[PDB]
Every structure is written in C-alpha cells, then in structure tokens.
Design a protein around this ligand. Structure first.
Ligand SMILES: CC(C)C[C@H](CC(=O)NO)C(=O)N[C@H](C(=O)N[C@@H](C)C(=O)NCCN)C(C)(C)C
Ligand SMILES: [Zn+2]
Length: 254
C-alpha cells in the first residue's frame, strides 16, 4: 500500500433533522457524534486485511463536516435534500430513500467533485426499516468522484455518495447500530455488494459468528462477525481499492 494514498477523505453532512434530533441543536454535540462514529468505522476499515496478507491500513477520515442548522428554504416545485418536507410524500416522516440519495448527490455535486466520498447523515424514519443507501457494488459509483450527466438535473452529478439515518421505527437507533449502517453503506462505496446466502463462508449461521456487515438484513452487532467484512466483501473491495487508491486516496492525517 502507498501510505501517501491510503485514506479516503470524506465530506460529512448533517442536515437540520440530524442537527435537531441527534445534535440537540448544538454544533459541538453534532460534530462530536460524527467524528467519533467515523473513527470507529475507520477502525474497522484500517484493520481489515483486504488480501488477508499485508494489504491493510486503508480507511477513512473526515475532511469537512457541514452542518445545516435549519431546513433549506425552497421555491414552490423546487426540492432540496435539506428542505423541511419529505419527498415525494410530504405526509410521511421521511423521503423515499432512493430519491433522497439522488437529490443529495445533485445538491452537493460541486463539493463532491473535490472529495473521495460524501456522506449524508439524517434523522428520518425510512419505510420498512431501511437505514441507509449508497452507490457502488450494485446490480456505477463509489469512492472517487465519477461524473454522471443528469438529463433531468441538467448538470453533472457524482456517484461517490451515500447516506445514513439514525432513526428507525420512531426512535433513535443505538450507537452500535449506527456504526453498522455507515460501515455497510461505505462498504458499498468501497465496491462491496451484499453477502449472498448461497456462500456459507460469506453468510455464516448464528453459531458460526453470525452474518457479516454487508449482509442485506440489518444485524444488531451482537454477533461476532457483524462488525467485520466477509471474504466476499474483501475480494470486491480489494479489487476496487487498487484501481482507486492512486486516483483519489490521500495520506492519513496524523
Ligand atoms: C444496515 C443495513 C444492512 C442497511 C440495509 C439497506 C442497505 O442494503 N443499504 O445499503 C437496511 O436498512 N436493511 C433493512 C433492515 O434490515 N432493517 C431492519 C431494522 C428491519 O426492518 N428488520 C425487521 C424487518 N421488518 C431492510 C431493508 C432489510 C428492512
Ligand atoms: Zn446495502
């Protein structure tokens, strides 16, 4: 690994929802939560041997934390990821998660072109227990800004983004749970797809340590494998990490 290029710098954004409900309406409380979360998530990444050998030391660090203290005032018909109402159903507490990710990508496109990854932290109750979403490892996107011209948006947007909500079923999720969501979404950004039941090695039984972080069904984090990447995820991220490090990875600060 190139110690000069082993860290994916992040642009972390907290919308007014997160600021109010998670940060208690205080910058200090909001940034502290995020700084500590990314650090724990980083511990997972830095310590992972993508090649089960010496290809490790790769992780994430926050470059900028943007805090949107109040909803984004918009003109009728116009939408923004930080606006007060949910879209498309203003009656629901949350946006359709997919449309929200696209909107976030559209709105922070300018800032996203200057970073390895952009991650939105919000506080809205997504339907059917969904906690987050991200580009990369699908059916393109992920680490390092890749342009995509949006016909509807009339500009280039970048697919190096993801989001995490710390609210599910009417309550704030446990910090141990939030860590898992971000690790999983960032996992997608790093190229990992979900672990398939078809490969036991990548989706063990509860008596074998449980499932790994990229399993599609949320894992409380009370089982051993829960906060680790399976061999399937490792292989994917390993392939991705190589062709990408030189492109946008930087040197770890500290
Ligand atoms: C951290 C997890 C892995 C993220 C995924 C979504 C995903 O794959 N993001 O990239 C999720 O929220 N999964 C939900 C989940 O497991 N949520 C749990 C809390 C749930 O609703 N469990 C009860 C089922 N009614 C689904 C969509 C499966 C309901
Ligand atoms: Zn997923």
């Amino acid at each position: 690994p190139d110690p000069m290029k082993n860290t994916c710098k992040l642009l972390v954004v907290a919308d007014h929802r997160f600021y109010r409900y998670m940060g208690r309406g205080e910058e200090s409380t909001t940034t502290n939560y995020l700084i500590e979360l990314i650090d724990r998530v980083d511990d997972i990444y830095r310590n992972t041997a993508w090649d089960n050998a010496g290809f490790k030391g790769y992780g994430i660090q926050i470059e900028q934390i943007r805090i949107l203290k109040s909803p984004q005032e918009v003109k009728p018909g116009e939408k923004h990821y930080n606006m007060a109402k949910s879209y498309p159903n203003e009656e629901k507490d949350a946006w359709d998660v997919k449309m929200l990710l696209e909107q976030f990508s559209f709105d922070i496109a300018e800032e996203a072109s200057k970073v390895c990854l952009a991650h939105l932290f919000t506080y809205q109750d997504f339907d059917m227990g969904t906690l987050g979403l991200a580009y990369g490892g699908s059916p393109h996107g992920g680490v390092c800004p890749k342009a995509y011209y949006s016909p509807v948006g009339k500009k280039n947007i970048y697919l190096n983004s993801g989001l995490t909500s710390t609210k599910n079923y009417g309550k704030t999720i446990l910090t141990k749970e939030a860590d898992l969501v971000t690790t999983h979404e960032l996992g997608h950004n790093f190229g990992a797809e979900h672990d398939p039941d078809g490969l036991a090695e990548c989706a063990p039984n509860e008596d074998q340590g449980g499932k790994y972080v990229m399993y599609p069904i949320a894992v409380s984090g009370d089982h051993e494998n829960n906060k680790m990447f399976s061999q399937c995820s490792k292989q994917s991220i390993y392939k991705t990490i190589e062709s990408k490090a030189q492109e946008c990875f930087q040197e770890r600060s500290n």
